[PDB]
Design a protein around this ligand. Structure first.
Ligand SMILES: [Dy+3]
Ligand SMILES: [Dy+3]
Ligand SMILES: [Dy+3]
Ligand SMILES: [Dy+3]
Ligand SMILES: [Dy+3]
Ligand SMILES: [Dy+3]
Ligand SMILES: [Dy+3]
Ligand SMILES: [Pt+2]
Ligand SMILES: [Pt+2]
Lengths: 94, 90
């Protein structure tokens, strides 16, 4: 009988230990989820920006192609003015 | 008392499994934290250069604007030189 309840004082302590640990596995399965959620949202955002960025990169490449054309047009135009001047020159010359 | 000792053993096995789960959950949290740190460092690397690129772009735009202006003046000066040529012939 002193045997028994002395024995019980251990069972109850073990139950108390289990409750703590269990509430623990409660608080963590509720975090790991939070950590995962915050990953999801983060990865999603990275992709909107990623898609946003590719779109801006594509626009850039188009403008550069136009600038390269202009780069050629001004060169040709300049050249035309130089030829035009040579003639005016020759007109005054002997 | 044998039955009670057996129950104590079952309880100890139950508590150990819980502790093991806690350990596993802790490791997962640590892994998540490691992922968060790598993700933040990467964002920082991406961010600082992105800003570097943004400043270079702004600088080029500033020169292109001078050029819009430079070409306009030149074109006008040419239009003016032709008016004078027309007048030379009338
Ligand atoms: Dy592309
Ligand atoms: Dy070119
Ligand atoms: Dy052309
Ligand atoms: Dy020539
Ligand atoms: Dy402008
Ligand atoms: Dy200027
Ligand atoms: Dy005029
Ligand atoms: Pt001329
Ligand atoms: Pt002329």
């Amino acid at each position: 009988s002193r045997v028994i309840e002395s024995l019980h004082d251990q069972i109850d302590m073990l139950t108390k230990t289990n409750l703590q640990l269990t509430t623990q596995s409660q608080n963590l399965l509720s975090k790991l989820e939070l950590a995962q959620s915050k990953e999801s949202k983060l990865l999603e955002n990275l992709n909107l920006l990623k898609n946003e960025n590719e779109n801006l990169n594509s626009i850039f490449e188009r403008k550069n192609k136009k600038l390269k054309e202009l780069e050629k047009d001004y060169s040709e135009l300049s050249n035309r003015y130089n030829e035009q001047k040579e003639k005016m020159d020759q007109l005054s010359k002997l």
